[PDB]
Design a protein around this ligand. Structure first.
Ligand SMILES: Nc1ncnc2c1ncn2[C@@H]1O[C@H](COP(=O)(O)OP(=O)(O)OC[C@H]2O[C@@H]([n+]3cccc(C(=O)O)c3)[C@H](O)[C@@H]2O)[C@@H](O)[C@H]1O
Ligand SMILES: Nc1ncnc2c1ncn2[C@@H]1O[C@H](COP(=O)(O)OP(=O)(O)OC[C@H]2O[C@@H]([n+]3cccc(C(=O)O)c3)[C@H](O)[C@@H]2O)[C@@H](O)[C@H]1O
Ligand SMILES: Nc1ncnc2c1ncn2[C@@H]1O[C@H](COP(=O)(O)O)[C@@H](O)[C@H]1O
Ligand SMILES: Nc1ncnc2c1ncn2[C@@H]1O[C@H](COP(=O)(O)O)[C@@H](O)[C@H]1O
Ligand SMILES: [Cl-]
Ligand SMILES: [Cl-]
Ligand SMILES: [Cl-]
Ligand SMILES: [Cl-]
Ligand SMILES: [Cl-]
Ligand SMILES: [Cl-]
Ligand SMILES: [Cl-]
Ligand SMILES: [Cl-]
Ligand SMILES: [Cl-]
Ligand SMILES: [Mg+2]
Ligand SMILES: [Mg+2]
Lengths: 696, 696, 351
């Protein structure tokens, strides 16, 4: 009848065994206080999901087991079934596993059967899928575990648990949406509870597909579904957004946070198993298509999941899943990201080159949002967060209440004007900093620039001129770039010495402000301020950035943003001749951010090369453009793209948000020395155009 | 009786279909002129091996076929069997394939059955292995091919080719390295000739493994074995080093270049099939197993490998494989990789910061080596090299004979001294430049440094001091780093404007000079000159570098190097107080380049975390060090490594040389925000140390 | 973790049982003193490889067993696993065998599955290949052995050895050179250490082939690989040139002499089993095939290859194989072959 189960989101850290252990323990202790008899944790939670090439290392395996032993001998784990994740090597093959134990015995080790090998995922690099479906083998335990557990071997493979009162089965992360998912046969076999341990990272706007899936599955097959997921940054450019859930028969009973500053969040629910049994009768109490397939092996477990609590235990009522707006998503994720980055880097704060333009502004807003979250958290009684703030600012007695106050201690904004900067942009940056609370620095680079160009003249005997002073296209560009790069040099100097100049220990993380759209076209200066330490908006669309900044006005009460939004998007690096005004980035690029986004998505999402893309747009923009015209747009896109790709190889690491990122380290593997005339492809395009231009 | 076969190495280029088509045609034409009736190409040669995520694009598939259709309708391919590679989608699964055609008819498509998923390889990201052994399906041909070939379908799978006189089998690359390789069962079923198309890249010293393996195989199994490989840079960090070979019954019959400036290099041999047959007939255990061997599907082909060429057509005689010394390898690999960048980037030359030290010196030697190579190639009658040069140099009449004259056209060294630089280092740089013939630039950064520091003072009211002037540790470092990044600002300014100042069109690629040992430890300044466009020595050991440079003294007649070798490895950026001499980078790092090299190899090559590494060293350095000491060495390494790993994320792409490269984009994936205290792991280490101190 | 293993080259002599016995004992004693818990010998080392038509003689079989019984009751062989070779008649078929024993108990008898029948070799004249792959029969022990060992039978066939810490397989000589060698399927089924007892003779310039092959194998397949061989003249035209080796994951860890005037030369190495395991764990195509691999019969053994030696027992470091020039080979081969004639012919010199 009535059972009480727990799932959870943990902020795990790659190879951080000590912390990882304490987090797992805490969740189990929490679940037990709430009356749970089964606890589900995230995929590979013992070592942290993102260990990458450390999985090749045997030490990883070893410590994981030492962590497992600690769990097994811990008095908290008594009388609750615990499903943890670690790597495990069986017969010289490395598997991504679930280790399920109860009262100092291992019940079953259950290896993953479908591995993620797309986008940021590459599990086949380190793990093998279990291929012997509906079968188990005897796994031989480490003497370390034997001595403790008093078992020689345990079942290893595709099996389910049978207890005195129920039948629980495992579905690991992506097995949930893999063709022919375990949950189908488990359902058929009569499995009433299905646990899914995830490690899925944030992706702007796609939170609902996870929820929908679990929902549909429970709706279609009946049953309780448990989903646990990592939450936070585990040591790289991903943010895991654990929307841990508990679903039954198509309804949701517990909704876990997508972004929060909690290291441990536990969901429970009290459900009557008979609701499953009667909901399944409601559908098909009959037989099926006559399948006669090999049935699931069964691990007998001497334990009752439901135990006497009924007399008081309130049944969980169904709930509606509340989603975040896309702007709320943006204001929360990169924000919580930046918080883990700061706290785990053990760095003294951030250094933000603030230009008075939209992106640098958005970046500033993310920090302010971070501060708010921290204040919220501290108010909420979050000891970990309080501990951390106190450690970051060095003040034992400190207690952030006003976000502007915390911000000041944590953020240093820096406006670096050139000879041609307007008074307006300088002002806007000054105002925005004033409003969020940051320590603002305003300086002029021109003395350093004059000096560099002096060195050049001194040695070549030649003086480059700006385009407006009769300079060549090359000279103009070079000059612009020098200023860009001097800014970067200065940014790092302050990162390294500004706190020093204020009488205080420590150094700052440099933050970048490239957006995903310009990153793709390479419309940036190699090694200017586009290269920093971390970039939180690197993966966000320009349009979304504007959207996010306009949303910040009212949510954070920052009026300084209006002028910033209204101002013309221009880079004041070159003097303006009489009769003309500044050129906008969109004219500079030779395409609007809108249409740039389309190329982006057609390229990475829809997997189109130039010919394919030419054909798509030809129809999409059939009214607006002519065949010759789209050819030119596409050609212009691919050439600029290819010419600039090398800029991508060295680009600052970015929070992952859009599934159309051009990021080269993990998500978008590509050449960087292309033939930039695309002779063959472009010829195909021409032929098509010529063919169409034969119509009357 | 006698058959004439060809294999080759092509300098393919990712997505360069036009180019790739022309090079394949050339190989086939060269093959025919030399009398071959079979021609084998490299792995995925139509599209070029390294298209990475473009493999997801239908356009890659489509254009590959268009190339194929071109090959099929081409007169040159008449009466020679052609083994060509491309990706194929079959039943909506994407495979790495060989396509064998003859006289406008596709004979068979052979999919790869084992993929490479380690190191720089990750075929599983985009392809699936064919897994039905000795089995075949019908491939439905694209309409375009049908209209040309008048075929509806062709066999797709694990099949062999039967001619009137022989039986030909395919082994694709990594299949040769798998435990139960195809060549075993193939040889037992009477396949006489085995063809292997590879696409494997350079690794210092590992050339013999490929040779020994193919030789062993034909020795153990009998038969002729052909290997083809890409040669050169196809668009990324890798150099494919085509050691294409022909081997029979354990002897080599043709050895292809490892590094050469040739786009197309064809090997042919004339062999007697009767030698194969009698070699096999002499192995009793083989024959006992061959009269019981499981059969391969055979595609019957109306063709004779041995024609009316028999008339005294001279049988090929056995040869000894000649190898390169490790220094010759270094002298030739990155050199060719550099030529390929220069010509395929359509850039006007290189800009090399030259410090008067070993590594930058090495980089200079590579460029000179390249120059010699180009000169040698031109003297050989190589028309594409001569064209390529004239294009780079914009003078259609130019003929590089002297290596020093070419060098001055395409290289620009740049010495950049600080206030503290010594006169010696200046002169070493200058003397090296004179001797290789580069255009040398000598300047002082001090004016620019003062200007930047003046900016900092104007805005903070504080002035940083060098440690020798009582500055703090941080001040001293900030100061050193500033100078360092200023050098980078200048480097790019000259890269962009130096030719302009000399009244010449174009720009330069900036070369880096980070070695693989410093890259590992993070012993470099983020965004100093460590950050360039490409780094030809970023994957090479400090010890190999010295060895290389010392080799260059006699090989290239460059005496300036001796002083460069003999001089103390010091970075003159800070002033030294008297009573004290300048600190070497080895005491700066806190470890010798030697012990560093060991950490790096134990790390990547032996897959070792800090506990494992401590254990290994403890035994290795048992005489030299005490366990307490070993722990400190290991902890210091791991500490430094992980505090600095972020420097890897934005670091300049390096030519891949060692298999212990710490490169983060492809070869060595790792997190970049570690818990740098390594609590768990260091605890385990201290436990062992205590345990060892108590007992004895 | 770390295991210490031994292999050797013995100057055996056809039918010189007394002598052959003493040399085997010496190797095992040398092995134990150097800390090994496993000792591999050369092919047919009890009787000496080149007995030729004496293999037809029951006496060869009988006396081989008497030697074996001697080894079994010998104190020196306590607590080390010994791989020793002799011919065995089983169900009235004569096989070239490895006999593995431990502490007065025979663990398994592994018959040769491919014989050499070319050049100077002609094993088919006197032996039969074992042809039931991954299969085992009961060998009925001779009474003499039963009374000593208190065993009635022992497994006879294509089986592997499982200890507490590891899995050991046999490849006999020419099996390494066959197309579908045992080491392939063995490595996929988790055999960590492969032992090879050979008896192959000198051929000018061909030494590298043996080295390259064993190296290639452990490179491609992972694992430790031990090779033993006779060294010297056993009674005829041939000189066995024992290039005994120890190799792991594609590197050599011990190189034995090709020509030397030593009767017994033992190689030991100390290796970490964890290095094998992680080397294999890094090969995706291998692991995809290993999770689908057909199983070998296993003889369970109540023994640990890795003992309380772990205490700073120094791991063996990789070495480069040093070869002889063709002239050094000529200078050394026939020279040793000559010393062996002189001393074994009990003659006073040469004319
Ligand atoms: N295939 C290839 N592989 C490797 N490297 C390659 C290469 N092709 C060129 N390169 C090299 O890469 C280097 C590129 O860097 P660099 O020479 O500095 O120039 P680059 O970064 O290419 O040009 C900067 C761009 O930024 C834009 N801009 C201007 C002003 C402000 C802003 C802003 O929004 O902040 C942007 C401007 O319109 C311009 O197109 C060159 O040295 C070039 O030789
Ligand atoms: N976990 C983490 N994730 C992301 N970023 C992290 C981080 N931890 C620190 N950071 C940040 O990274 C930045 C590091 O750069 P920066 O502050 O400039 O300093 P950094 O590059 O760390 O220090 C430079 C090193 O170069 C050496 N050096 C000196 C002189 C000459 C030479 C030579 O051979 O050329 C070398 C010197 O001994 C020193 O150790 C800092 O802003 C820091 O806050
Ligand atoms: N005036 C400025 N002050 C501070 N940072 C700037 C300034 N201008 C540009 N940046 C930085 O440079 C990048 C944008 O380049 P740009 O479009 O030329 O303004 C972003 O990473 C900005 O943070
Ligand atoms: N005096 C110099 N002139 C030109 N390049 C230098 C100089 N010093 C350092 N570099 C560059 O900076 C890196 C080495 O840093 P450092 O060890 O401080 O000399 C290499 O990439 C060099 O090319
Ligand atoms: Cl163990
Ligand atoms: Cl069952
Ligand atoms: Cl400090
Ligand atoms: Cl803007
Ligand atoms: Cl804007
Ligand atoms: Cl200090
Ligand atoms: Cl130009
Ligand atoms: Cl040096
Ligand atoms: Cl040096
Ligand atoms: Mg903006
Ligand atoms: Mg140097």
């Amino acid at each position: 009848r009535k059972v009480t189960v727990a799932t959870c989101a943990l902020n795990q850290w790659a190879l951080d065994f000590e912390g990882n252990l304490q987090r797992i323990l805490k969740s189990i202790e929490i679940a037990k206080n709430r009356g749970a008899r089964y606890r589900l944790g995230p995929e590979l939670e013992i070592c942290g999901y993102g260990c990458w090439d450390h999985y090749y290392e045997s030490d990883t395996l070893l410590h994981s087991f030492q962590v497992l032993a600690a769990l097994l001998e811990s008095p908290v784990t008594q009388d609750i079934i615990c499903d943890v994740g670690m790597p495990v090597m069986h017969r010289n093959v490395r598997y991504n596993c679930r280790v399920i134990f109860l009262n100092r015995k291992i019940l079953l080790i259950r290896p993953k059967m479908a591995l993620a090998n797309e986008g940021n995922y590459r599990e086949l690099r380190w793990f093998t899928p279990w291929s012997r479906s509906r079968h188990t083998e005897e796994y031989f335990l480490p003497r370390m575990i034997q001595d403790l557990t008093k078992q020689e071997t345990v079942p290893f493979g595709d099996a389910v648990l049978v207890t005195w009162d129920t039948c629980i089965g495992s579905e690991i992360c992506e097995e949930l949406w893999t063709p022919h998912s375990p949950h189908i046969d488990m359902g058929l076999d009569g499995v009433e509870i299905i646990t899914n341990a995830s490690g899925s990272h944030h992706v702007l706007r796609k939170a609902n597909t996870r929820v929908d899936l679990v929902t549909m599955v429970t709706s279609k097959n009946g049953g309780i579904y448990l989903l646990a997921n990592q939450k936070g940054c585990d040591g790289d450019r991903l943010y895991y957004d654990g929307c841990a859930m508990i679903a039954m028969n198509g309804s949701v009973f517990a909704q876990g946070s997508q972004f929060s500053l909690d290291d441990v969040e536990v969901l429970t629910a009290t459900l009557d198993l008979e609701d499953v049994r009667s909901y399944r009768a409601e559908i098909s109490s009959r037989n099926l298509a006559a399948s006669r397939a090999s049935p699931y092996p069964r691990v007998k477990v001497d334990f009752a999941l439901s135990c006497h609590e009924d007399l008081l235990a309130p049944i969980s009522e169904p709930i509606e899943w509340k989603y975040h707006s896309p702007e709320e998503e943006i204001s929360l994720g990169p924000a919580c990201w930046l918080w883990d980055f700061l706290r785990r880097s053990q760095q003294a704060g951030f250094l933000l080159p603030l230009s008075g333009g939209v992106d640098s502004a958005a970046t500033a807003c993310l920090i302010y949002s971070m501060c708010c979250q921290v204040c919220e958290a501290v108010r909420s009684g979050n000891e970990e967060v309080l501990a951390d703030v106190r450690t970051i600012v060095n003040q034992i007695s400190y207690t952030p209440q006003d976000p502007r106050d915390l911000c000041g201690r944590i953020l240093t904004t820096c406006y670096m004007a050139s000879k041609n900067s307007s008074q307006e942009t300088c002002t806007r940056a000054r105002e925005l900093a004033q409003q969020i609370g940051s320590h603002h620095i305003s300086l002029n680079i021109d003395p350093a620039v004059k000096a560099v160009m002096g060195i050049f003249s001194l040695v070549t005997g030649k003086s480059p001129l700006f385009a407006a002073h009769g300079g060549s296209s090359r000279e103009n560009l070079a000059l612009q770039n020098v200023q860009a790069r001097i800014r970067m040099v200065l940014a790092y100097l302050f990162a390294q010495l500004s706190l020093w100049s204020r009488g205080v220990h420590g150094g700052l993380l440099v933050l970048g402000s490239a957006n995903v759209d310009e990153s793709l076209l390479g419309y940036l200066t190699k090694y200017d301020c586009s290269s920093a330490d971390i970039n939180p908006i690197g993966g966000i669309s320009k349009t979304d950035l504007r959207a996010f900044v306009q949303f910040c006005i009212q949510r954070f009460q920052l009026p300084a943003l209006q002028s910033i939004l209204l101002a013309p998007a221009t880079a004041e690096l070159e003097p303006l001749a009489d009769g003309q005004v500044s050129q906008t980035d969109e004219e500079d690029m030779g395409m609007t951010y809108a249409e740039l986004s389309v190329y982006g998505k057609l390229r990475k999402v829809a997997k189109m090369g130039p010919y394919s893309m030419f054909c798509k747009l030809l129809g999409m923009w059939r009214h607006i453009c002519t065949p010759r015209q789209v050819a030119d747009k596409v050609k212009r896109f691919f050439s600029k793209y290819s010419m600039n790709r090398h800029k991508m190889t060295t680009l600052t690491p970015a929070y992952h948000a859009e599934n159309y990122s051009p990021e080269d380290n993990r998500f978008d593997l590509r050449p960087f020395l292309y033939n930039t005339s695309w002779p063959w492809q472009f010829r195909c395009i021409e032929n098509q155009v010529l063919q169409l231009e034969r119509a009357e």
